[PDB]
Structures are given as structure tokens and as C-alpha cells.
Symmetry: C5
Subunit: 376 residues, 5 copies
């Protein structure tokens, strides 16, 4: 993902203006090809009109150029694009929110499941690795960036996400459906067995682990649903038909006619129509926003770093459930042990950030003494 | 459902342009009939004006064509369609989200309910089959694709969703309402009996099963509500009246008059009005989006595959609660058993997907030493 | 509520076109009176201009007709109506979602509360009847369709929702507020007493019952809030002022002047202005959508069937907690008892609905062998 | 709050038309002053142009009037107002939803905390009074209607919301922040002490009370956040600049020039410009909607009745936790004790409200016998 | 944050008009620089046209000015800005809601964890300080206002948020990722150890503490996600391109030509174009709204006071868990101890705020006696 949050931290002189100089993930890279095709078509038509067309043919073309320009509607094209792009952006953010993070589950698994011995170490590692396996199984089906990393289930075995025994078990259970739901059932069975084995003292704790596990299951199901149930094809087709019909119309209607005839609005001849290219950039970039955001799991530049997400999740989970289990910093009295009102200091650069506490909007209301007395 | 997610993975040269070549679930199949009716009416009126109308009649028709075109409003028609289609799409996605998936319930039922013997096997299978029966009972009432598969309750018995004893019990309880709520009460009673029978050791576990059961109940209730409380008929009628009045106006106002009279804007005569057909395609396809999405449980091409959902749910549920119960892969140390920092390898195709971790937008801010010192 | 879901199941030839033939709950019944008033005013003004006005008066009227038409703005009127109607529809759906259904509570009450004897039967019936009483108490205050059925609290006693002892107790507790909150406190006290009496074995179960009870309490509170805090009166007044000012302007500006003067745009005289009536139908029907949906608990035709909801709720609750308690269908092995992969059959009409399972958007990506190898 | 729900129950002949006769909370009272200022300025400018300006000055003014009118843009002003007013209304409804109601907490406190003796009575009363104190502490900081009732913390002591011991304790804990968070910590400590004292038998019940307590804490925090983090000042300034610039332009551009010069569109002179006042009413009322709704806790007429909310909450809480604790209506068999299907009667006025149950949209689908047979 | 809630409490005469006099956080400070640049460019072009351009050059410039003005589109620019600014504002409010407040956690920690001795004091303080440390760790990565206060992890040690032992432990666990997730795992381990140590009597209480802890974890994860996954760069670039292209067009098209040529619309020459500056203020301020709100954690004036939030959180948490633990106000009978209906008095200023209780919209419906009788 292209992150520019640091650049737009402050609303300064042209803070968004500086963003026009970015290339990666920009509108520039998305539509240079379409812009070049538009230029080629426009200049080909212009040269044909200038040279090949005879006087009567030029007159007929002139009438068409006049007719096409009047039709050029775009309050409707803005309407359709705005409702669509809003839909696409909302779905894109929901897709990101439904990404499963094992941080709530890994904390619980680190805490509840007991045993410093090798058995407890193995139990905790496998319990968190089942969640990671479910996440990677859904991601390699939803994203083309993770599929290229794990083309087949043997690649998951080679990468350490799946042990060979789990691979054999998953093959034995094979059904004509996506198998991303198996690890959650494995986790439920293993945690139940752990509770029966004494590793989890009180069942309330087992219920807590399952709830943080089924929340991950729901998030993965939402990812699968967003992958499967795409934005309706008819709506995308309507939007692209509108945009491309607009610009095919502009190919003729925005043509600069012969100044000799002196048609209204064509008095001056310029070699390039700046506004049509500017309208092209604006409208086609608006379409490209939805085009890039419609599938955020691809391998574009503004698409999510799903590979990094997978790697992080595995690393932090295996660290928390194994080395951080019952290894805590020495508990010592704070700096503010006997200070009733902790006031951490401010750096010189951050001195101005000190503000008085907001006590509510009614703090500054002034009343007379007669106004403040109670009535019977 | 028409899935094109793989095609639009990357914002490439005309990625949406390639979607205009699709037929199934497209705008093409939805509105070819209306387009043909529009063509027939337009050419009939054109031929009548050319031939049947006399000179005074042609003059009166010309005035009408001029008058109708000026009225042709569409910033309002775009407004009404955009607010409606947004409503329809939001309701469509909510309807999909309210589809019940037994994956959270089946994991719990596989884990908690104990017994490898035939009694436990039967208990788990019936507990999950009650949830599947509730789901199919609501779906055959909400969707015309599942009703054609189970026209009567005897078809549910023949398909294995309902045992004959359950069919008799459901007939005995008959009330003048939809009976989709019976299986949830059956599930509650059966799980309570199982807890009294020792199959579920600690009640906390019974509470967990009921919560995952009542969430499914709420989802099914939302499906029934969306089926019953449709989008208001007045709002749909207003939208279709707007669109069809627009195009009935365009039938006359967009007519190409006699070039001999040389009216303003009718200097050149073309046999086909490309813009009116393009506006027809755009606006009628915008209407068809809402028309197709208003009832997503039909048997269109972009409607949900409810039959496949039912079949999957039954298969995966009966697999998880029966064969996967207390059958777990052999627990063995991982590939990363003694590696502090797991770093799974990258394929050659996926090498570029490796990214540095994002440490926050303030990581790159630089400060002087005097700026970094604390103040008293 | 007017349900047309079956009619719009398939996007067929004019599926919305067939909805224009409906009368009940339609735009036709909503605005025929306003349309007739508009016709009467328009023709009265037309006759006055034709006859009563003298030549100078007719000239002054002509100038006014010309002036009024130019002002006729409606991109703004569409804007205001669209933002409002969206607000009204969102609130309408939220109001429906906040309707309380005792299905989650009745399942729990049927399961947890024990005793086949008359004492347990009475306890379960009263526990669910308290929830039904709370629901009807909020509904008779929020809806004018249920108030006409229970005008006074004695009608609730006569209808069986309230026993005379409960009526006396509710009268004794009388406060100058709506008393819809009493049954929830009664339910809490009664369930606590039942747990102390041994009818509910383990408190976890009592906590489950209370949570499903307080969710109903929150839903009823939301209904009361939606009834009390209406859409701001200023916003409704602004919308209606806009619409009615528009059409009062159209009463003069859209008048067909004398063709003899040959004003621009008034060359041809027609007795009826079709577009003004079409704009009237569109805009006034758009207003009527919000007008009908602003209070969905009235007794219109598209308003919710609150009386039916109350009756159903009572019937299904009293059935589930009394006859269905610990009465379960005989537990027998399924049709798929030894079939590893259940495949329910398909009817001849539903054969085409069989689809292959979606395995994810990356299933069809093809890679070379060199692309699939891991890198060091 | 101005409640007109009863008036708009039915979509009848001019149901919204009758709302134009309301004064309190109307657009009439909100903008009469601005309308009078606009009238005064418009007539002052008109008189200056008629009298003070000489012939050349009048000609220059005429040119300006012509120039200003053309600029008069308002599709943009509608756009900005619509996006803003939608934001303001959404925030207003969220602010109302975040109002804390102790009804869920008071039911639990009435049920769980045991003891008919004076100790239990005092314990329950103080437990619910802590929640009421937290609610009033946040409300007197968020609303200017409650601050005028409790200007100082001594007023809370005098009104019974705070005992003198609690006032002393709150003063002793004083920090330079809003102290609305203290009562929740007091409640947690007191409920923990009650559980240690035997008043709450099983901790599950203590967890239930705390959850209903922390939900209230979250709602109060949201109220404080909505008070503190207002809608951005820049966005409000942009909207008001747009509206007021529009109407300052209309002060000159909409001026009725001398008919003697016979400018286009100024042929007829009227003393009052009805459309400009109508556009003024529409646009300024649209702005006043957001202006009134931006702070719903003031003391306007459509602002929330926070004082009544506080009084109700205290009354119902102290009633439920004290007199209604373990005082239940006599449990007796229902009217429907032996009736399998309860059918409550209908009044004569409500007879038409009886409807047949909706069995789903697929109930009426008809199939042939060959269509209904299963296929191998 | 700029708080003006007190100023807009009442919809009074020009309540928003008074907001135009504010400077801090206003549109004035945001766009004075861009306005000055626009003025300089406009006057430079005007002087060049007046002086440097010759008669033929002036004629060509005049034609360009005429051509540019006609293109000046802005219904589209309003559309794009409105959809964007709505997106930015929604994300801004979600970012604020995801701010973690330890108030729910600190109440639980104060209540449940037992021990007045130094061991319990230390345990409670460290448990709440872990949550505060997680919050500050995410905030110093998400906000540039907190990073300037804690440039390095040693600053957290010096400020008391992190003890040296925790700093050493965090360094030992170092991974190439953001380490904001460590304190939650530390909290889980420490609370588990406390439960094993007897400080937390019943595990249900441990489950409650973890749930309030993982909710904070989810909120911090959402903050990190909002920081990392910014609004797509292509969409921001499209919006700024639209706005700046509009105003570059206005630099020429809105130029006041020579009145001597007497072009249509340029009859009168004014030195300043008021409308272009007014359109500049409106559109650029609309853009500046999103520009300021895109990163609400900067150190602007309307950005959140994250430093104050951090300081408050630490102070109130350390106060509640340490001094307020098992220190409760003396429990005494209320003022309303024997009053059945508490009626707190009203001040003289607040007398008018007394309102009658709303009993529902159907309270005032009147029915005849025949209407009120039940039917068989």
C-alpha cells in the first residue's frame, strides 16, 4: 500500500499539491496507456478531417462535430461514478477490516494454556499455528499475491505453515469445497482436549479462547464472501459504458474545426484540446480509483501487503505463544509510585502541545445568584 | 453469482474494458428486449412522420419534436436512480451478510459434545442437522431457487434434511405461521437434555453453543424480514415512472426531423440516433442494476447460489461433527521449533512482494538534540 | 406491508413495468387527490387567462408566465428530496430492525427452565408472557394500529396479555411516565426467584436468559426513541416548502399561452401539459415516499403489520415454552448415516441450479515450474 | 423535542401540508430575523438605485445587476449543504443513541442484589444512584439545559443526586479533568464489596452487572467525545460562506431594474421578488436544519429534553431497585392456559388490521408433477 | 481541537454568522497562502494582457478568455469533492472512535484485583500501566504530536510510561515489526499469574478483565490500520487535479477583458473578480476540509489533543487503580429514602425546561365506545 500519511500530517501550503509529484500508485501510472490511446485516436481523426475529407465531407464532419459536442453530458456521468466509487471504497475498507489478526487469540493462548515443559510449548505453538493456517488458507484463495507464494498445498508444508501430518489429514478429508474451515474445527478439538488434559484449568478460559477463534472464523468467512460475491457485473459495465461512450463522443465533438468557416466556439484553432485531456484525466482517474480498489488483494502497488501480513502474523504469534509465555518484566514500583498526580514532562519541540483539559461546553456559562437558586 | 474478481485483480490497460465482452449476468442480456422494443417504436414513429403525416401534420409534429426535446430533463433522473440503486445495493449486501453459516456452530458442536460411541455420534449429527434444517426452512421460503428443489415438506424428508419423526412432529405443531422457528427450539431442548445427560461436561459450554445458535436464529430472522418487508412499492414505481417517461419523451423529442426545414440542431439527418441509444443503455442499465439486485435469491445468473450454499453447509457440517470429532493430526514440533524469527521463503514469482515493515508514519521524523531534551 | 418480492424475483422483460399496474400501496392512491387539486387550479387559472383577462391583462400575464418558467429550478429540489428520502428510508429500516422478536428468548426459556409439572408450566408461561407484555406495551404506545386494538389497559387484560393481578400491580406502581419498562424488571425478579427455587440449575443459564431479555429491552427502547425523537420538523417543512413552491410556480410558468402572440416555446397550444403532470407525478411521488415511510407504524397499507406481529409472537411463544418443552422428535440415524459425502438430489425443475464450488479467484492462475520454486 | 409523529401517521391529503402551520420548532421561528434583515437590505438597495443613483450611475448599476445574476450558482450550494446536513443529522442521531438509559442496569440490580432488610435496600439504592450520578455528571457537562439546573456540585447535593459524603470524596479526589468517570469506579468497588459480603450469590451475576455498567460508561464517553470533538470549524465556515455569499449576490443580481430600459428578463417590474424569498427560505432553512441540529443538547425547542430524561431516569431507577425488588404479581394460569392456539380478539375499529400470515415469497409458485420429481 | 459547541448551542440570529470571526482552526488560516498565490498570478496575467500583449495578441487572448470561461465546469467538481470530503470525514470520526480509553479496564482492575498491601498496589498499578503503555506505543507511531514528545524508547522510560526492566525486556524481544502488541501479551500473562496467585478470586473475573483488554487491543489495531492504509493516493490526486485545473482555467477565463471591444459579459470592467475569489474560497476551503481531516493525529489546531489524552489516561488510571481501590464514600440513606416519587427541584433559570412526559404518539387518539368494544 502507498502510505503518504506523514506527508499530509499538516494542512500546509499545497500539502496535497506535493502529492501530484508521486509516481508509484498514482493516477499517472494507471492511465498513461489510455491517455496515449486517446491521443492517437484524436490526432488520427484530426489528420483525416484535415486531409482526406473533401469540402463537402469536411462540411458534413463539421456538422457532426457541432452535434456531438452539444450532447456531451457529464452531470449524469459524475452521478454514476460518484455512487459507484463510493460503493467500491466502502467495500474496500470493509475487506480490509475483515482481515484476521491473531493478536487477541495469541494473547489468550499465551496466558491460559499452561506448561513450561515441551508438551505445553508444543500445544501452544500448534494452537496458534492452526489459526495462522486458517488465515493463510483463506488468503491464498482470496489474494493473487499469496497464491504466487504458495501455488500448491505442498508449498504450505515447505514454508512451515502446515506440518506433513496436517497435510495428510487435510487430503484425507478432501471435499469438493474450499477447505479453509478445517483448521478452526481442529482448533476447537485440540483446545477441548487440552482442557480435558488439565492444560486449561477452568472452562470459562476455554470459552474465551473459542470466542476469539470464532471471531477469526467470521472474519475469514467475510473475506471469502467478498472474494466470491463481487460487485454486480451489470453495474460495472454500466459505469464503463458511460465513461467510454463519453470519451468516444469527445473524440469527435471536441475536435477543433477549420477556423475559416468561423463556427461558434471554434474561432481559434489550437493543436491540443487541454480541457478534453483535463476532463479525460479527471473522469478516467475517477474510474481508475474504483478499478484499482475493486480487488484490493491483487499485487498492484496500492493493494494490501498480504504477504507481509502473513509473515508478521506468523512471527508475532510464534513469539508470543512460545517465548513470551510466563516470562514477564520484573515488577517494580513506578516513577510515580508516591506522586498523587503524575505529570510526565514535555520535550522542547512538544511544549506547545500542552493544552488545558476540556471541562465541557457548559463550563463557561455564567448565571446570576437569583438564577442559581432552587424553586419550590 | 457472476464472479469476475480474477479478471479485475490488476488495474491494467482497459481492465474494465475487457468486462464489456461478457454476456452472462451482463447488461446486454438484461436489456436487449427493452432495446428492441424501443427501436421498433422509434422506427415506427419515424416512418409515420416520414410518410403518413401531411405537410401541416409534419409541421405540427416538428413543433412537438422541438418542444419535447427541450423538456428532456435527466439531472433529476440521475438523482433518483442514484439514491435508489444505492439503497438496493446496500440492502443486497445486507441480505447476503445475513445468510447463516453453521461454521461457528459446527466447530463448537464438534468440540464440546462428547462420545465416540453411536449415541454421541447421533447426538452431534442431530444437533447440527437441526441448524441445517432451520437454514433450509428459511431459505425455501425466501428463495425461489430452493423452493423449486423442495416444493413440499416431503421433499425435505426425501432429501435427508428432515427425518420422518421430525416431519410428523412439525405437522403436529402446525400453526398458521411460517415454521422456520421450530428447529431452534428443538436444538435448545436437545442441548439442554445433552447437558443433563453428561455429554456436555460444564454448562458454560452449553451457553456457548446456544449463543452460536441464536446468532443463526437472528440471521434467519433478518432473511425473513428482508423477504417480507420489501423496498416500498411507491419508491420503485416513482423510479420506473421517471425512467419510462423520460424514454417515451425521447421517442418523439429525439426524432430526426426533415433537414429541408433546417431546424436548429436538425441540420443533418442520420438514420440512427446513437446518443439516445447510448443514454438508453446507460439509464436503463442503471435501472436494471436495481431490478436484478432487488431480489438476490431468485434464480437469475448474478443471484446467490443458495442451492450450493445449502449443499455445502450440509456436507461440511456433517463432516465436521462426525468424522472430525476428536480426530486430530499428530502433534509434532514445527519447522520453526528452535528458530527465534520464522522467515518463510519466497517463490521466484513472488520475490517482489517482499516489503519492509511499516513502523508508523512518524518513524522518519527527524529532530535535533535540543528538540529531544525534556523540559522542567 | 405490500410485498412484491415474488413478482420481482427475476430481471425479466419489464419486471418493474408490471409493478405500474398495482393499486394498493402505490403512488397512484397516495397522490390522486393532490393531482386533482393541481388539475383544478391549473384549469381555473387557464380559463381566467383565456376569458376574464383583457388584452393588457393578458399581456401582463404572458410576461409573468415567461418569467416564472425561467426560475423553475429543480436540480436543487431533487438534491433536497434525495438527501431527505434517504434519511427517511434509513430510519424506516432501523425502526423495523428494532422490532422485538421473542424467538431467542423463547428458545432459552423453553430449554433452561425445568419442570413438566404445573408449576414449571406456569413459570415458563409467565416468564415469556412478561416479554410479550413489554412488547405490546411499547407497541400500543408507538403504533396507532395496536392502540385501536387495545385502547385501554383493561383491553390488555381482556385479551389475555395481562392477568388481573399484573394489572393491579401495574396500577399500584403508577408513575407519570410510560410504564413499558415494568415487565422487564418483573422478568428479572421472577427469573432470579426461579434460580433460587431450583428451576434453573446453574446461574450461567440465568445470565443467558437476562442477556436475551435486555436485548429485547434495548430494542423496545429504540422503538420508543424513534417514536419520540421524530425527524426534525424544520427539515420536513423545508422539503415540503420546496416542493409546493415549485408546483405553485409551475401553475403559472407552465401555462400554455396564446399561440397568436407566438412567444418562444409557446408556438403550439395543447390543452394538457403532459410534462408538468409527469414532473408532478415524479416529484410528488418522491415526497410521498418519505411521507408514507416517516411513520411506519400507522395503519396505511405499506406500514408494518404490527397487529399480526403481536399475535404471532404471543402464539409462537406460548407454544414453544409450554408444549415444545422437553418434547423432541425421536432421535434416529440419518439418511446419510454412513455416506461420507451427502449429495441431496435435485428436482427436474431445479437441475440447472447445480453449480461447481467456488475455490477462490486464484484457482485458475497458471505458473511455470521455475516460477513455483522457492528462493533462498 | 417537537413531536409530530401522530400527525404524520397516515399519508393522507396534504399530511405534510398541515405541518406548514406549526410555529414551535419550525423554520418560521428560526429564520424570521434573517428574512427581515434580507428584506431591509434589499429594499434599501432598491430605494438607493431608484433615487440616489443618477442616470450614468443607474446604467452602471444595471450592468452589475445583469452580471451578478448570471453568476448566481446554486447546484454547488445545494451539493455542499446536502453533504453537510446529512453529516449533521447522522451525528445528531448518534448523539441521541449514546444517551445512557439505566433500564438494563436497574433490572439486573433489582434482581441480583439480595436482601429485603435496610442494608440491601441501601445497597441497591446506592448502586443505581452511582449510575444516575455518572449520567447527570456527563449531562451537566454536555448540555446547557442541565447545567442551568445544576450550576455547581452543591446543587447536585441539594437535588439528591449526590450525598454529602460522596461530594466530600469527589472533592478529595480532585484532578484537573472532568470527573464524570468517578462513579463508575465507585460502582465497581461497591459491587465487588457486595459480592464479598454475600449480597450477590454467584460472581457470574457480578460480571453481568459490570458489563451493563461499562456499556453505560461507553455511552457517556461517546457523549463527552461528541461534545468535545465538534464538526470541523472549517467545514461549517465553508458552508455558511457559500450560503451568505449566494444571498449577498442575490441582493444585487435579483434586483428589479427599470422597465424603461427593457433589459432581457426585466421587462415587468414587481415590488417583491417572490422567487428570491422562496430560494431564501429554502436554502436558509436548509442551513438552519444543521444549525439547530449541530448541538442537540441546548435548550432550543427541538433539542432533547435532557432534564426530563434525568428526572425520569432517577424516578424509575429508584422505584425499580427499591419497591419492585422481589415484589411480583401473583402467578396465576393465563386466559390461554388450555387453548392450543391463542387468538386475542379484535376491536371493531381494528377489525380491518387482521391479516393473513406471510409464508414467504415462494409460497404461490406452482410446479407440475414432472417438475416436482427428484432426479438421480 | 477547536471546540465551538458552546457558541452554537442555540439556533439564534446568525449563530453560524458569528463563527466567521474565528481565526484558529478556520478556513482563513488554511488558505490565505493559496489565495495570495492566486491573486499574484491573476494580477500578473492581467498586467501582461494590458501592457505586453499587442493588438493582435490582445485579440487572441480575448478569444482564449472567452473559450476558457465556457468550459468552466463545476457541477462535476462539486460532485467529486462532496463524495471525497464525506469519505474523509467518516474516516476521521472512525479514527477518533478507535481511540483507546482505559476507563472500562481501570474500573475492573480497581474492583477485581484484591489486596491493600504493597503487593496488590504494585500489581494493579502495573496491570493498568501495561494498557497505558500499549496505548502510548501505538499513539507515538500513529501521531506526530506524541512522537515529538517521545522521540525514542528511552523517552518513554524517562517519562514513567516504561520501567527499565520493561525496556530491557522489549529490546530483548525485538522483531522487525512495530512492537505495540507486546504489552497486551504481558497483561494477559500477568493477569493469569495474578489469578493463580489468589489476587483474583474467581476466573469469571479474569475473563472480564481480558475482554476489556482485547477490546483495547482491537481499537489500537484499528488506529494502526488507519495510519497504514491511507485513503488511496489516486483518489486524492484526482480531487486535487480537478480543483487546481479548475482554478488554472479561471486564471484566464475569468479575466476582465477590455471594455472597448464590448464582448458579451465583459461590458463593465472591475479591478477585482469577487465571484472568482468567492468560488475560490468555497471550493478551496472544501478541499482544505479534507486536507486537514485526512490525518487527524498531526499537530494542527483542529487535530486531536493526543498528548492531553495520553496524560489524562495515565493520571486517571493510576488514580483509580491505586487510591480509589476499596475506598468508597460512606453509604447513607438518600434524600429520597422514603419518598415514593423523587422530584428534584428546578432552578429559576431552568424552570421552563420542565416538560410533561411523552406517553407515545397514540395517547391522544380518541375512539367511540362502539369502536372500543371487542368483536367475536
Amino acid at each position: 500500500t502507498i502510505t503518504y500519511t506523514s506527508q499530509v500530517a499538516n494542512a500546509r501550503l499545497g500539502s496535497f499539491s506535493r502529492l501530484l509529484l508521486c509516481w508509484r500508485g498514482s493516477i499517472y501510472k494507471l492511465l498513461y496507456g489510455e491517455f496515449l490511446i486517446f491521443l492517437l485516436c484524436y490526432y488520427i481523426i484530426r489528420f483525416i478531417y484535415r486531409l482526406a475529407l473533401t469540402e463537402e465531407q469536411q462540411l458534413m464532419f463539421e456538422k457532426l462535430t457541432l452535434y456531438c459536442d452539444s450532447y456531451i453530458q457529464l452531470i449524469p456521468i459524475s452521478f454514476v461514478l460518484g455512487f459507484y466509487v463510493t460503493l467500491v471504497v466502502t467495500r474496500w475498507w470493509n475487506q480490509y477490516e475483515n482481515l484476521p489478526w491473531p493478536d487477541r487469540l495469541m494473547s489468550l493462548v499465551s496466558g491460559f494454556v499452561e506448561g513450561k515443559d515441551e508438551q505445553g510449548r508444543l500445544l501452544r505453538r500448534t494452537l496458534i499455528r492452526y489459526a495462522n493456517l486458517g488465515n493463510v488458507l483463506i488468503l491464498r484463495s482470496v489474494s493473487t499475491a499469496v497464491y504466487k507464494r504458495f501455488p500448491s498445498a505442498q508449498h504450505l508444508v515447505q514454508a512451515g505453515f502446515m506440518t506433513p501430518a496436517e497435510h495428510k489429514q487435510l487430503e484425507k478429508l478432501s471435499l469438493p469445497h474450499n477447505m479453509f474451515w478445517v483448521p478452526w474445527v481442529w482448533f476447537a478439538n485440540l483446545s477441548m482436549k487440552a482442557w480435558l488434559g488439565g492444560r486449561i484449568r477452568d472452562p470459562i478460559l476455554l470459552q474465551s479462547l473459542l470466542n476469539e477463534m470464532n471471531t477469526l472464523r467470521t472474519q475469514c468467512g467475510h473475506l471469502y464472501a467478498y472474494d466470491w460475491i463481487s460487485i454486480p457485473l451489470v453495474y460495472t459495465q454500466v459505469v464503463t459504458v458511460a465513461v467510454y461512450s463519453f470519451f468516444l463522443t469527445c473524440l469527435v465533438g471536441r475536435q477543433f474545426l477549420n477556423p475559416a468557416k468561423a463556427y461558434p466556439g471554434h474561432e481559434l484553432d489550437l493543436v491540443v484540446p487541454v480541457f478534453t485531456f483535463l476532463q479525460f484525466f479527471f473522469y478516467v482517474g475517477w474510474l481508475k480509483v474504483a478499478e484499482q480498489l475493486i480487488n484490493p488483494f491483487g499485487e498492484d502497488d496500492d493493494d494490501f501487503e498480504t504477504n507481509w501480513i502473513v509473515d508478521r502474523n506468523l512471527q508475532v504469534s510464534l513469539l508470543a505463544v512460545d517465548e513470551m509465555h510466563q516470562d514477564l518484566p520484573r515488577m517494580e514500583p513506578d516513577m510515580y509510585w508516591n506522586k498523587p498526580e503524575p505529570q510526565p514532562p514535555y520535550t522542547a519541540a512538544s511544549a506547545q502541545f500542552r493544552r488545558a483539559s476540556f471541562m465541557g461546553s457548559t463550563f463557561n456559562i455564567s448565571l446570576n445568584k437569583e438564577e442559581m437558586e432552587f424553586q419550590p
